[PDB]
Design an enzyme around this catalytic site. Structure first.
Site, PDB file in Angstrom:
ATOM      1  N   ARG A  39      20.885  32.454  31.821  1.00 44.75           N
ATOM      2  CA  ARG A  39      19.752  32.523  32.740  1.00 44.75           C
ATOM      3  C   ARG A  39      19.700  31.302  33.658  1.00 44.75           C
ATOM      4  NH1 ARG A  39      14.738  35.488  29.457  1.00 44.75           N
ATOM      5  NH2 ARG A  39      15.478  37.626  29.871  1.00 44.75           N
ATOM      6  N   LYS A 216      14.594  51.958  18.071  1.00 42.34           N
ATOM      7  CA  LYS A 216      13.524  52.947  18.084  1.00 42.34           C
ATOM      8  C   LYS A 216      13.713  53.967  19.205  1.00 42.34           C
ATOM      9  CE  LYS A 216       9.815  50.489  18.442  1.00 42.34           C
ATOM     10  NZ  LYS A 216       8.384  50.070  18.309  1.00 42.34           N
ATOM     11  N   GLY A 374      22.732  39.877  25.965  1.00 44.18           N
ATOM     12  CA  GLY A 374      22.002  39.645  24.732  1.00 44.18           C
ATOM     13  C   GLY A 374      21.995  40.817  23.762  1.00 44.18           C
ATOM     14  N   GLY A 389      13.984  43.282  29.343  1.00 48.19           N
ATOM     15  CA  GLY A 389      12.733  43.983  29.576  1.00 48.19           C
ATOM     16  C   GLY A 389      12.601  44.450  31.015  1.00 48.19           C
TER      17      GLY A 389
END
Ligand SMILES: COc1cc2nc(N3CCN(C(=O)[C@H]4CCCO4)CC3)nc(N)c2cc1OC
Length: 409
Positions: A39, A216, A374, A389
């Site tokens: 980053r 999930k 990641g 995200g």
């Protein structure tokens, strides 16, 4: 989706000007030691650009972790990040122990030409997020006047605003949407990220393959839905796959991850896929484990044989890797989000390593390849995103508040 309509850094005049720049320096740390600096490096091109085009100053601001509006300088300070940026820039980074207030404003008011400043963690103030938790862990809300004064402080640190914080672009936080400067430009990282995702999602080269992994299912129903309207093929792997296998193929999955909420919509998703002519590739075999542990006993199973006696699948098998490799072989465009195995543990990393191999190969023969950084896997691909995200939001078809807040051209 791109920044085509927005003011960008390349058409922003910075000569003689103070640039206040919001970056995503929220990097992985351990004992206040940085363990992945991607980053930081990703922001360097915008910073170097400002410097080489005569900026009086570049003031950098970011969050780190989630201190929830209380100063935690012994746990979440950006001080370590200043040292890392210096090495990468090959230039001094002045680190301030706060991000707003008289002292920080005085420090930023008229710095010597070429100074690079990094502010302290923005989330040490409840006004960044607009809410948080007190020192006793009770939820608290920021007060409008203080949020305003917080924003006005940040805004005083520069003459023009650049947001290069793609990783934070889904967050409508003060430093992201609340800087009151007339010119608000996106940086090179923001521009690059949005160009790659816009190409893939609006105008891909086909066949376009999405590889969706992770755990999930319930929280990825919108993602899958939107992607089914854009892709030609889709791999559904990782922990997610067992829900589809149990429902669609009567598979015995043992104690493998099963999403009861997800299971209710699985057939809807597949009906949509078939109607759209999207080829779905689920795993056909698995590396199994008797416990959810790095050093568990391992076994092998297929869809047909089932996963046995209270065992769980923690990676795909060797034949799944072949199916995945065939889909990758057919792709001209690939977006990979989410892991297909528990690759932190070496006994369950094989699926991920083979797949990355296939995606690297595809890139070499001209496939456009977009992977997450990641969580998805462990520079031989077209684009490795700095935003997990944030990219998820884009993949779901949502708007990025950090992007909307920028000036139009
Ligand atoms: C096949 O790929 C994956 C499988 C994953 N499985 C799991 N779990 C976590 C939850 N599990 C358990 O709690 C164990 C313990 C006894 C019940 O099963 C087992 C399944 N978690 C995950 N995070 C998994 C992630 C995966 O790939 C990304």
């Amino acid at each position: 989706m791109s920044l085509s309509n927005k003011l960008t850094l390349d058409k922003l005049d910075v000569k003689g000007k103070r640039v206040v720049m919001r970056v995503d320096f929220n990097v992985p740390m351990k004992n206040n030691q940085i363990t992945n600096n991607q980053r930081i490096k990703a922001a360097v091109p915008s910073i170097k650009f400002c410097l080489d085009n005569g900026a009086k100053s570049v003031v950098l601001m970011s969050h780190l972790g989630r201190p929830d509006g209380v100063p935690m300088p012994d746990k979440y300070s950006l001080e370590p990040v200043a040292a890392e940026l210096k090495s990468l820039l090959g230039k001094d980074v002045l680190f301030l122990k706060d991000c707003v207030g008289p002292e920080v404003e005085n420090a930023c008011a008229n710095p010597a030409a070429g100074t690079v400043i990094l502010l302290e963690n923005l989330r040490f103030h409840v006004e960044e997020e607009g809410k948080g938790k007190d020192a006793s862990g009770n939820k608290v809300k920021a007060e409008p006047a203080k949020i305003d004064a917080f924003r006005a402080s940040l805004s005083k640190l520069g003459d023009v605003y650049v947001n290069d914080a793609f990783g934070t672009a889904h967050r409508a936080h003060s430093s992201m949407v609340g800087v009151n400067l007339p010119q608000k430009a996106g940086g090179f990282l923001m521009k690059k990220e949005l160009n790659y995702f816009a190409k893939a999602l609006e105008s891909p080269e086909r066949p376009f393959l999405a590889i969706l992994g992770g755990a999930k299912v319930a929280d990825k129903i919108q993602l899958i839905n939107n992607m089914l309207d854009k892709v030609n093929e889709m791999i559904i792997g990782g922990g997610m796959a067992f829900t589809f296998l149990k429902v669609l193929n009567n598979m015995e999955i043992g104690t493998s991850l099963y999403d009861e909420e997800g299971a209710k919509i699985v057939k809807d998703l597949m009906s949509k896929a078939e109607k759209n002519g999207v080829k779905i590739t689920l795993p056909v075999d698995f590396v199994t484990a008797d416990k959810f542990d790095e050093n568990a006993k391992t076994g092998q199973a297929t869809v047909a044989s089932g996963i046995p006696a209270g065992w769980m699948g923690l990676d795909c098998g060797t034949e799944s890797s072949k199916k995945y490799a065939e889909a990758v072989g057919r792709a001209k465009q690939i977006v990979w989000n989410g892991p297909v195995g528990v690759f932190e543990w070496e006994a369950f990393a094989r699926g991920t390593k083979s797949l990355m191999d296939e995606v690297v190969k595809a890139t070499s023969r001209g496939c456009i390849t977009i992977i997450g950084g990641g969580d998805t896997a462990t520079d031989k691909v077209s684009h490795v995103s700095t935003g997990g995200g944030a990219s998820l939001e884009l993949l779901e078809g949502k708007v990025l508040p950090g992007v909307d807040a920028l000036s139009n051209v």
